Amino acid sequence: VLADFHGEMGGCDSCHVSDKGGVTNDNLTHENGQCVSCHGDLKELAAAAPVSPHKSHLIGEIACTSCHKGHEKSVAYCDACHSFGFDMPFGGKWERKFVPVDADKAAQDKAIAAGVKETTDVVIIGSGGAGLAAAVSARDAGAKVILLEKEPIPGGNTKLAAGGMNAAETKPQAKLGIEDKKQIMIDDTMKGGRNINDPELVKVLANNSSDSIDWLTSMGADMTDVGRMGGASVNRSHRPTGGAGVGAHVAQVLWDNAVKRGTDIRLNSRVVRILEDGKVTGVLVKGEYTGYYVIKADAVVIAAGGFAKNNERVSKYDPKLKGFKATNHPGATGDGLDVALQAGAATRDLQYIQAHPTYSPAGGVMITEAVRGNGAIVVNREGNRFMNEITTRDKASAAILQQKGESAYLVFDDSIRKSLKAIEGYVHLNIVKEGKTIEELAKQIDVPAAELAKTVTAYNGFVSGKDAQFERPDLPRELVVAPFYALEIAPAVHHTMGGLVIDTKAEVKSEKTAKPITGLYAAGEVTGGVHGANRLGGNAISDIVTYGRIAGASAAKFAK
Ligand SMILES: Cc1cc2nc3c(=O)[nH]c(=O)nc-3n(C[C@H](O)[C@@H](O)[C@@H](O)COP(=O)(O)OP(=O)(O)OC[C@H]3O[C@@H](n4cnc5c(N)ncnc54)[C@H](O)[C@@H]3O)c2cc1C
Ligand code: HEC
Ligand code: HEC
Ligand code: HEC
Ligand code: HEC
């Protein structure tokens, strides 16, 4: 393993700050500083390559040591989701074993009394979009902030986002001639979530839309290309120019503005217990390399994201999903909830679990809803349609599940490809089948040519504005410019709509006293209420930025 190959050279000293060994802090800044000093940084190594592991869509600081492990085998972090078969020096298999947030309780207790190490104003749990947005906001005229992330790299699921951040009205919307109104945000969001959404929450998720999309803009962002996500009316899923993805883009812009103000960001740092006055007093952090430690603070923003990804838990509410795959990064396992629950927080809609209908088994990645949005039709194993491709995710997941072999085929054109740049990525991953004709496409896919062609030529007729098969309301493009493409997709656990109970101010309410537990804040996928029982495409990112801002600001007034 790497540190032995380097022990052979000059010592412990090479990397560690001292000759005895040991890490100073959990971000591992010294050591990574030593990596770069003899090997160069990522740009340098990226430039040197001919798909390289040293240059990717990942956002924020990506330590060398997140893959190049000192005292143990090393693994590309890319293998959490892809199977690139990189040949990593000192290689190993990617493996994560979920460990309870409460186990090693003696140790945690032994460690809570054992001093008091640092004190800050406001602690933020997690570095996706809700956590960084809170960082900007707490920090931005207010307090001191210490943000902890347990992964070795930042941005959670936020950074994988593909399809857009919903916004209403006054976004750049003006500029494209897209006519839209606030109440039409609320109203499709109540419709989408089957009318149980907390109405006050959906309201602020409507009424702050525009400013969250202006905020991002005050910061360096690019929210100007707009599309159609399943379930809304007037077009409104904001994204970067020409069909790229908002996630990475938003994460990155929030990471830099968070780092640019004075946030104290720390990776390899899991919050495992909120500190009990019962007013929140601090937090119990297990730094992966520095051990346990207390942070005293006056406000705790919980922004830990969802639990999709923990198949043990998801299978506990909806065992249909047992064994299913997830579209999430490896950190969305429910830690956050557990920490909050321990602190006596109330929750709601924990059982409504969103499965994304078009995940790719072969690539280990979700394939954006925008591919259907821009014109793709979906086809079963027989060669025919079976659904209104822009329906709600739950109905779309269900119909593919009810099909010959449990999977289905996205089929689109050269015209749909051109028009949605996320498609270049799928092409880059080698997961896209290509036909010079539909007959050619059929052979690759193993679906029958006459039947698929008849399907496509009929779908074209529907395209003539009427889908006399399945009612699809929008028929954007015809599907007639060669070459023609296909990808088999299937449903995968994606988002957990439920979670902690919070108000419009981001406060968390106690189960027992049905009022706020003091100084306890929360924002993002870890909360419940915003999406009722079904989340609309593009409402996650809008929820997270709006609600992070509110959670950061609320927490700063607290302590002030
Ligand atoms: C593949 C994919 C595509 C999606 N695309 C879109 C889209 O295009 N538009 C849209 O609106 N929505 C989209 N969604 C939904 C959107 O991504 C939200 O679900 C996601 O942004 C959640 O934001 P968050 O801040 O709550 O959490 P995350 O981004 O998950 O950030 C989470 C931080 O907490 C860290 N953490 C967890 N527990 C602890 C702990 N105990 N201590 C320390 N750190 C901890 C986690 O590792 C995590 O990084 C997408 C989701 C996925 C997975
Ligand atoms: C200078 C004193 C170094 C520091 C600090 C680190 N590394 Fe290193 N590394 C160094 C040398 C001179 C070599 C040898 C080349 C040879 O052919 O013998 C290496 C080797 C590696 C490798 C190579 C595996 C291989 O393909 O042969 C890797 C992946 C590597 N080093 C990574 C690495 C990391 C992650 C470090 C930070 C902890 C780091 N090195 C420190 C010199 C020095
Ligand atoms: C995971 C995404 C990685 C991160 C972050 C870093 N490295 Fe890397 N490194 C990784 C792989 C999978 C490989 C080898 C396989 C391949 O096909 O590239 C490497 C290779 C190296 C090497 C040897 C090759 C070379 O060009 O010298 C070195 C010295 C090295 N890596 C060092 C290094 C440093 C200094 C990093 C921080 C900037 C770093 N790696 C990040 C995987 C990943
Ligand atoms: C799970 C959290 C991932 C990790 C870790 C890495 N990638 Fe990824 N990657 C993931 C998704 C969900 C997507 C598709 C997004 C979309 O627009 O639908 C991707 C995309 C790619 C691509 C193609 C598109 C592009 O932007 O080039 C490549 C080449 C790719 N990913 C490679 C890659 C590497 C080298 C990684 C290690 C640094 C890596 N990914 C991490 C999911 C996840
Ligand atoms: C660079 C290649 C290293 C050398 C030569 C040594 N270590 Fe060492 N160390 C390195 C890294 C990247 C880490 C972080 C975690 C990981 O395993 O990747 C560490 C961490 C440690 C520890 C903590 C143990 C743990 O919980 O994993 C110790 C005790 C430590 N480092 C000591 C140490 C000693 C005594 C060394 C001399 C032989 C030494 N390390 C070499 C990177 C490197």
Q: Is 335 known to sit in a ligand binding site?
A: yes
Q: Is 428 annotated as a binding residue?
A: no
Distance in angstroms (rounded) separating the CA atoms of residues 56 and 58:
6
Dist CA 389 CA 319 (whole Å): 25
DSSP-derived letter for residue 326 is: B
Q: Is 37 exposed, middle or buried (0-12, 13-18, 19+ CB in 10 A)?
A: exposed
CATH number of the domain residue 4 falls in: 1.10.1130.10
- Distance, in Å, from the CA atom of 78 to the CA atom of 126, rounded to the nearest integer, reads 20
Sheet (strand 237-239) strand order = 165-166, 237-239, 225-227
Q: Which of 247, 224, 238, 236 is nearest to 185 (CA)?
A: 236
Q: Which residue has the tokens 């947030």?
A: 101
Structural biology method used:
X-ray
Give the 3-state secondary structure of residue 294. strand
Residue 463 sits in a domain of what CATH number? 3.90.700.10
Distance CA 254, CA 264 (A): 14
The number of beta carbons lying within 10 Å of the beta carbon of residue 516 is 18
Residues designated catalytic: 393
Cβ distance 473 to 389 under 8 Å? no
- Which is it for strands 484-496 and 499-501: parallel, antiparallel or unpaired? unpaired
Do 277 and 264 share a structural domain?
yes
Rounded (10°) CA dihedral 208, 544, 56, 4 = 150
Find the 289 Cα to ligand 3 centroid distance in Å.
22
**Residue numbers after which the chain breaks, C to N beyond 2.5 angstroms:** 50, 277, 463
For residue 140, the number of C-alpha atoms closer than 13 Å in the C-beta half-sphere is 21
Give dist(CA 162, CA 327) in Å, integer: 12
DSSP E strands, 153-279: 165-166, 225-227, 237-239, 264-266, 269-276
Can you say how many angstroms the Cα of residue 442 is from the centroid of all Cα atoms in its chain? 34
Give yes or no: residues 214 and 347 share one domain.
yes
b/e per residue 259-281 (b: at least 16 CB within 10 A): bebebbbbbbbbbbbbbeeeebb
Say if residue 84 is in the same domain as residue 103: no
Residues 486 and 503 in one domain: no
Domain boundary among 49, 65, 96: 96
Rg of the chain over CA atoms, in angstroms?
24
* Ligand 4 touching residue 366 (CB < 6 A): yes
Asked if 472 and 538 sit in the same domain, the reply is no
- What count of other Cβ atoms lies within 10 Å of the Cβ of residue 342? 14
Given 3-state DSSP classes, what are the helix, strand and coil percentages for the chain, each rounded to the nearest 5? 35, 20, 50
Q: Which helix (H) or strand (E) holds 433?
A: strand 433-435
CATH of the domain at 517: 3.50.50.60
**Distances, alpha carbon 169 to alpha carbons 179, 202, 210, 417, 481, in Å:** 8, 15, 6, 29, 35
- Give kind and range of the element (H or E) at residue 213: helix 209-219
Residues 152, 246, single domain; the answer is yes
Could you say which of 444, 469, 496 is where a domain stops? 496
Pairwise CA distance, residues 223 & 317, whole Å: 36
Token couple for 397: 């997941």
Assign 135 to helix, strand or coil.
helix
Cβ-based neighbours of 122, under 8 Å, separated by 6 or more: 138, 142, 143, 144, 145, 146, 297, 298, 299, 300, 301, 552, 555, 556, 558, 559
* Alpha-carbon distances of 478 from 257, 341, 456, 460, 465, rounded to whole Å: 43, 51, 9, 5, 11
Contact by Cβ (8 Å): 202, 189: yes
The bridge status of strand 507-509 relative to strand 527-528 is unpaired
Q: Distance between alpha carbon 251 and the CA centroid of its chain, in Å?
A: 10
E strand intervals along 85-192: 118-119, 122-125, 145-148, 165-166
520/508 Cα distance (integer angstroms): 6
Block residue for tokens 């927080």: 345
Residue positions counted in the chain: 560
User: Are residues 491 and 537 both part of a single domain?
Assistant: no
Residue 196 and residue 87 in one domain:
no
Separation of 295 CA from ligand 5 center, angstroms? 25
> CA–CA separation, 189 vs 486, rounded Å?
31
3-state SS track over 385-416: CCCCCCCCHHHHHHHHHCCCCCCEEEEECHHH
C-alpha 50 to ligand 3 mean position (Å):
14
Tokens of 516: 């706020």
Q: Which of the 8 DSSP states describes residue 536?
A: P
* Residues framing ligand 1 (Cβ under 6 A): 125-131, 148-151, 156-158, 160-165, 246-247, 270-271, 303-305, 327-328, 331-332, 335-336, 339, 366, 495, 524-526, 538-541, 544
- The stretches of 418-468 forming alpha helices (DSSP H) are 422-428, 438-445, 449-462
Specify the residue for token string 């309201």: 203
Q: Which tokens is 111 given?
A: 């460690």
Cβ 301 vs Cβ 289: under 8 Å: no
Q: In the structure encoding, which two tokens stand for residue 243, read together? A: 């069909």
What gap in Å lies between CA 494 and CA 356, rounded to an integer? 6
* Phi and psi angles of residue 438, each rounded to the nearest 5 degrees, phi first: -65, -40
46/53 Cα distance (integer angstroms): 8
Ligand number, closest to the Cα atom of 231: 1
Question: How far apart (Å, rounded) are the C-alpha atoms in residues 105 and 116?
Answer: 18
Q: What distance lies between CA 286 and its chain's CA centroid? A: 23
Q: What is the b/e burial string over 498-509, where b = at least 16 CB atoms within 10 angstroms of the residue's CB?
A: bbbbbbbebbbb
Cα–Cα distance for residue pair 147/129, rounded to 1 Å: 12
DSSP β-bridge partners for residue 345:
510
Last residue of a domain, one of 476, 496, 516: 496
Cβ atoms of 488 and 407 closer than 8 Å: yes
| CA 226 – CA 56 distance, rounded (Å) | 25
Q: Taking the C-alpha atoms of 365, 371, 372 and 373 in order, what is their torsion angle to the nearest 10 degrees?
A: 130
Which DSSP symbol is given to 308? T
Look up residue 131 and give its amino acid: G
- Cβ pair 60, 255 in contact under 8 A: yes
Report the alpha-carbon distance of residue 405 to residue 58 in Å, rounded.
34
What is d(CA 365, CA 84) in angstroms, rounded to the nearest whole number? 13
- Give 195's Cβ-side CA count (13 Å radius): 0
Domain assignment of residue 120, given as a range: 97-352+499-559
554: nearest Cα among 522, 526, 509, 510: 522
Strands 353-360 and 365-366, sheet pairing: antiparallel
290 is in an annotated binding site: no
List all residues 6 or more positions away from 163 whose beta carbon is below 8 Å from its beta carbon.
Answer: 227, 229, 237, 239, 245, 246, 368, 369, 370, 537, 538
Tokens of 334: 């429910």
Encoded tokens for 407? 């999977």
12 is in an annotated binding site: yes
Number of domains in the chain: 3
Contact 271, 287 (CB under 8 A): no
Query: HEC states along 483-514?
Result: CEEEEEEEEEEEEECCEEEECCCCEEEECCCC
- Name the residue with tokens 């330590």: 63
132 in the same domain as 61: no
For this experimental structure, what is the resolution in angstroms?
A: 2.5
For 481, what's the count of Cα atoms within 13 Å in the CB-facing half-sphere? 10
**Is the same domain home to 136 and 249?**
yes
Residues 399, 420, 307, CA angle at the centre, nearest 5°? Answer: 50
Does 120 lie in the same domain as 225? yes
Question: Mapping DSSP to helix (H, G, I), strand (E, B) and coil, where does residue 292 land?
Answer: strand
Instruction: Please tell me whether residues 447 and 301 are part of one structural domain.
Output: no
